[PDB]
């Protein structure tokens, strides 16, 4: 009984939303490039303890918690596959923004994001094969984008390195460019919220169901908690603990959306076509809640 | 593979891609090349 808006993909509002998302990504990267320098990146690359522990946490927890959640909640096969693909996806770039919100040594954050994406393009089909045994015996390994991952990584890294160079060359443009970028980020975020509300319409209520909401709410919170626990277990620095925990919970749901769209017809994946959106809003809300908790704890310290 | 989409780290719909001429939102998107989609008869099943 699931229905989609009559012209979902092809509409002026959706095109505007796509452009606004692109501008969000570019300006977020540009504004984030101010807080990192080459020397710290080199230092973190030379000492791979944090990088390795972050990869281990992400790629040994996210698919694992996805599979465990699906088995525990006795989800439908399509839903279990959807959350499994979401878990197998690399960490998104929203983790970098969240780490900036907790002043979390952004050099390690960007290094972890880049290495996580690069390791994803290799080992995501492997995790899909070794975790989808029992649901969808189909291959599902040629449906994962490969060249798109590399192009997206390069296109993300370009504005960040532009900002880093602009920093290292001449600080004087921080108070002339960062404030403007923050302003455009704010207006574009408001536009994104209203445009998603307009585009989705009332079809989201089909996605609303006690099982999908439960899994998509448990997944990012479990990711944050497990990342924090595992990073603190290895006697890592507190700033490193915070950034690792915040990165391991964030996910790139766009890959899951494209993979599910390619693998199956729209009628098979009808009600959970909005699952990436649910995961995105829930991870955003939980990140904001953690931001508020951290700032309240800081006030408690002072 | 058959997926030629440039994923956007901030994105929740299949048309959110970092591609200059936004064909994914046009009438004829061409980021996927799999016509042999699996109908998956046991999709709506629990184990």
């Amino acid at each position, epitope marked *: 009984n699931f229905t989609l808006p009559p012209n979902f993909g092809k509409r002026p509002t959706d095109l505007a939303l796509s452009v606004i998302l692109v501008f969000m990504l570019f300006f977020i990267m540009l504004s984030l490039g101010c807080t990192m320098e080459f020397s710290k990146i080199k230092a973190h690359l030379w000492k791979p303890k944090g990088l390795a522990i972050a990869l281990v946490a992400q790629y040994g927890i996210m698919p694992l918690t996805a599979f465990v959640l699906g088995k525990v909640f006795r989800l439908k096969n399509i839903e279990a596959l959807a959350i499994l693909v979401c878990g197998c996806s690399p960490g998104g770039n929203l983790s970098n923004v969240f780490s900036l919100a907790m002043k979390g040594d952004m050099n390690l954050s960007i290094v972890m994001t880049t290495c996580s994406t690069f390791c994803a393009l290799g080992m995501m089909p492997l995790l899909l094969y070794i975790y989808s045994r029992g649901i969808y015996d189909g291959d599902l390994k*040629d449906k994962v984008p490969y060249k798109g991952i590399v192009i997206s990584l390069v296109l993300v890294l370009i504005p960040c390195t532009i900002g880093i160079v602009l920093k290292s060359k001449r600080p004087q443009y921080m108070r002339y460019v960062i404030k403007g970028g923050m302003i455009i980020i704010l207006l574009c975020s408001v536009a994104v919220t209203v445009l998603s509300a307009i585009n989705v319409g009332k079809s989201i209520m089909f996605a609303m169901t006690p099982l999908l909401i439960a899994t998509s709410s448990l997944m990012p919170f479990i990711g944050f908690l497990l990342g924090y626990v595992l990073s603190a277990l290895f006697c890592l620095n507190g700033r490193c603990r915070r950034t690792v925990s915040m990165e391991t919970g964030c996910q790139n749901v766009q890959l899951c959306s494209t993979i599910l769209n390619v693998a199956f*017809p729209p*009628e098979v994946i009808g009600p959970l076509f909005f699952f990436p959106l649910l995961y995105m809003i829930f991870q955003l809300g939980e990140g904001l809640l953690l931001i508020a908790i951290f700032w309240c704890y800081e006030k408690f310290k002072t | 593979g*058959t997926n030629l989409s440039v994923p956007n780290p901030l994105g929740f719909f299949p048309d959110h891609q970092l591609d200059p001429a936004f064909k994914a939102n046009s009438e*004829n*998107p*061409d980021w*996927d*090349l*799999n*016509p*042999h*989609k*699996d*109908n998956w008869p046991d999709a709506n099943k629990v184990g």
Partner: antibody
Amino acid sequence: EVQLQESGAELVRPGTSVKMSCKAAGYTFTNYWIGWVKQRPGHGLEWIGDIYPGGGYTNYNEKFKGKATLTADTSSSTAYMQLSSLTSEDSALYYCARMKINNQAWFAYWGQGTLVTVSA
Amino acid sequence: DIVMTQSPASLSASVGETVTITCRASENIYSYLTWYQQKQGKSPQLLVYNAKTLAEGVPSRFSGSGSGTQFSLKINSLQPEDFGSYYCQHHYGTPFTFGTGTKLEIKR
């Protein structure tokens, strides 16, 4: 104008292989699927298999899986089918067809057809 | 595997007479069906795709309407230029079955 050109009529004794070509013109030929359809004069149509010339990805009908082989040869832009072992059953008219979206499986442009007769 | 069947195996109609042909699918295919028209001694040509939209360069008199398991192809005004077999096909499954034929012939 996109056009598909077939090789021509063939007459082959049973048990021997035969291959036919579908030269494509008027478009890139590298980013569009090609499907092969076999039609008997006294029966309906049936779908043999599909080939993507860009990457060589192919999908085959289960019935024709054993005795159909598809090749791209993107340099000359001529798709090929190999019939492998031949019997009197598979004497029909063979069509090469191209999709339009690469996402849906309705063919838009068809070749002139290749007639294959199997008999000793 | 999905089996496609066409109701009228043969059908005769004079020029300028409305006529419909019915297609039936074994399972639900969510209007993933396309109509082909083949003339005598010619390769088949795409006529209607997705069971509703008319292909490029086709006369406007053709019309198709259906979803699920029942499909139809009205011709409305009948012209001598179109007289031949008509075929169906689905994209839902992998085997892509083609269904049987439906021949249109002159009436006298």
